[model samples]
Target: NLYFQSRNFIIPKKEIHTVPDMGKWKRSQAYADYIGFILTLNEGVKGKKLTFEYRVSEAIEKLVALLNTLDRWIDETPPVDQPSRFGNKAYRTWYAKLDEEAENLVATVVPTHLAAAVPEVAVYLKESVGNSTRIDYGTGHEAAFAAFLCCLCKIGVLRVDDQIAIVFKVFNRYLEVMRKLQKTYRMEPAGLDDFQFLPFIWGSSQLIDHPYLEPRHFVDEKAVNENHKDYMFLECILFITEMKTGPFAEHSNQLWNISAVPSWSKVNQGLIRMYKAECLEKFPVIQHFKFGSLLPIHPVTS
Candidate 1:
């Protein structure tokens, strides 16, 4: 129960303030855990079946069920009549309630001894959705949820055996709720997806060993549809193809060029670094990141 020596888990505090702060963040236990969580799962799911129906570890299942509870809230709180493409007012209604229940929800999947850590984990879950004030969602917000899961692992509720379900079942459900939130609230999307970046990154890794899926296949609508169920990368491509109408070559030009890339390994690595550069390296975006005992921003050497 005493995950971090005898230190009781403390509420996470903001750590990133300026670009220079990243040097410390990179050296922090949080960054190492964050990166390891991604790469660790990427390795685990290699050549493994990736699907929603696939069963995962019990803790992850309970976590997914908790996400399901949040997902239902979207239906319960409908989008109020809105006028613009920016944040919708109804989102405030939904977020207000989420802010209240996130503590209880996090406690649901955590152990009874982890009572003090619930509020710490809940902060990431609440922030993951986006600022209730801005009603805007983006990769930074998505990263918050990733940190939430990382904390769960740090505390031992989620373990290595749960990796597949962590992504396939738990994260996929997150994608669905995020998708609905984006649609329902008309939240701004960065094309690469303000609502997501990790899925594409993680999804590409899943495709690395696929017998026939080449990086080029990402451009093919039919190919993506047929295989989308098995791969998150394709699922992402399918969403764009449906959400954005136009010649794929003209619209998703960066990806069109990626089609010329030779292998999935290259693309997967590219996506990882891309996320680091675009999401992690950006001071403005990362400035919002918070840290805790489980994911403390303190340098590893210290």
Candidate 2:
């Protein structure tokens, strides 16, 4: 799709030699502290459910904290203090590089296909529906991608055999997708169209899949299910909370790039309709939030 193709920049992690001083050490310390909380949390759950939940929960907390901190740093930092002709354009340069990278990526996504589901699973949030409503799709996709990859590596293809021939096939396919996405927009207009934008938001601060898998399978079904459930719950938590106060606090606000367009209103309308008309019998747990109001009226203290 033209929209998805536009957001396909592929700079390897190693390529960026310079990182502007952004209080990363402090951020790293925060991650370490959270890691301890996760270890403790996992200890209480026990068995496989504990493992799966721990991974996704740990990731969510980490990324939210990191991005919030980064945004705070940006807000506090002074603007470039030099003449238009010459100055330490650290922030400008960093964002420009990100833009160039993002722009190149978007150019490859065929605009028509950008809104199409990249994954086969029924996405809880969708792009075209509307920007304001689907804001949580960013995080939802992150949780989904991670769950999917974990399933793929730990169960799907790995179930057949541990053979290198079979294993490498899966690895190579993911690489090919990345390669195709990068090449798709070479000379064309690039960067996410509105509908195509959230996945970038979802993935930029986090990861979608795993690069490698352990040679041996643990083969724990209960744990895998728990992991999947954690993602589902994470989606619920993000959406429920964000719905109260998201980017769409003002419904009229919209964001559209040369490659894509976004409307949150449309997305949420679909969600509300789906909630009412469809019987998600398989996932009755998700239905509760649909019927009632949820609020944190008091301190979350023990």
Candidate 3:
């Protein structure tokens, strides 16, 4: 039901300046919106059946195209010919292009009537790629992209049927873009841990087979590369494998431990709970989150 039930505007459409209520109920609603849509993707569908449902409306297509354009920019902006130990300066160039075009890029996907929402959505899109200043990527940045898609859903640009595409297509493509940026700029992972939370949540959901796939099966480089396209969780592991050189258990103890879980369902559930606690609820992560008319922070009044 959360799939079809689009979250509606609670606060009045106005500029948010000072601190808002941010009560438990309000925060819970926002977290529900975040976690609910993720759960919605797994309804009744088999794991292998997961795919990009490309035959969608023009708006969804435009959104995908916009993401494609952003991805292309990554290739267009070459890394600077300078030596640096941390993030590459070229990433700043890539981010600068996104910053300059965020408004116009957003206009391509969203309808004219929803023009007012562009500024907010644009911020999410701009922030989603990675921090230009820091030249680093993290779950907080991934959370912004998720918020971008959710905002599109709230505005009805993305509908119930579009959920699969949002995950398999748009979100997947966004992940690809981030990976490219990370590699091209040599950007650091936002955290010391090897993997990110977003991919694990969606990827684990993709492996809903009867004989649930286990973590041990994916630890190998060949297995990770071969299965990553079919599973997002594997893709996360594959990235870690490529980035870090060590024993899987040593580099990603958390994920290695997760593999030992009895089922993907348990892994998926635990991931959702972890995401809620570690990323969504954490003030530092969600603090940068901007809530406006579409998604509000004000307490709901009867």
Candidate 4:
């Protein structure tokens, strides 16, 4: 049902797990898909001055409702005392609720026209939440949410006009929800310490709005603190500062190096490339990625 519907084709779930023979074109296609998504977002803001009103697309409104529902569920499932020092066991209960309600959740948010892809989209939704088994999250889980949005765009359920909403509206809401989940349940980071990759990926792109931005600008703690609300990358850095007490350089070397990237354009491009290599290309990361006719890992040829 996810693929092979009518005439449309899709890569099977099993095939994505099986590592394909590597090639330049194959890697290029992978990069193109991920990078193209970013460019599509950039295209949304091209030549037009951005405003919150313009960001409110119908698809985004539905997505916002979906996120709100998840937020409510968090309230419903409060964490309980546990012996483990890691994440609370209540998160498992929360995930079970999400798993149980996923079908209905998908039906509610997705338009009737795109209802056929609900199962496919639901997989991404479930993946978007932290791992139930480990109660941990990182760039891999973040990538799943990105893929979910990308799948919607691919299927025309979401349009290019909704790109900014996808970032500022949808993705930001996701970050908020995840942060709450982490703080509430004491969830663990997947890896790479507290520094996450996605915020920098999209956040640096957001920084592109300020062409005059320089490396030195990011070095000033006061400047980053004051203007964090204006930019996503700075906001992420602020979060890092809040979470870790040590010197910024000791806790966040990756970010420290990024501050030296000269310009947001270069930072944006570099993060895209790094995301492709570290997130998309890795076997473990892409191993469980689900694809459908709308996003075939192996493009069909007649």
Which candidate number has the best lDDT? 1
For residues 1-302, what per-residue lDDT tens digits would candidate 4 score against the true structure? 12233334343253454566333324433335755786677555432222345648777888888889888989999999888999899899989988888768877766666666777767778877888889887776776777778877767767766777887778878877887888788888873336257776667766664766665577578988777766666777776777777887778777787788877778878877787777767776656566555555564333
State the lDDT of candidate 1 residue by residue for 1-302, as single tens digits: 24543337788889887778989887888888788888887776666557544556778878888888888898998877767657788888999989999998998898777678898889999888877777788888889988998888878888777778888888888988888887887776534553678987778778776788898888887898888888887887887777677898877776787778798888888878888888888777788889988888887744
Candidate 4: residue 295 Cα off by (Å): 1.9
Collision pairs in model 4:
none
Q: What's model 3's TM-score?
A: 0.85
TM-scores of the models, in the given order?
Answer: 0.92, 0.20, 0.85, 0.85
Residue 64 lDDT, candidate 3, scale 0-100? 78
Off by over 4 Å in 1: 1-7, 51-55
TM-score, cand. 2 vs. native: 0.20
lDDT of 1: 0.81
**Residue 246: error of model 1 in Å?**
1.5
Clashes of each: 0, 40, 1, 0
lDDT of 4 at 281: 72
Report the C-alpha lDDT of model 3 over 1-302, residue by residue, as the tens digit. Answer: 22343334332222223235334423444556766666776552336434544446787678879988987988898888787778889888888888899989998987766666677778778867777777787787887788788878877888887777777777777778777888888887663243257777777777755364575676777777766777777777877888888898887887777778778778778887888777766655555666665555545434
Per-residue lDDT value at 297 in model 4: 52
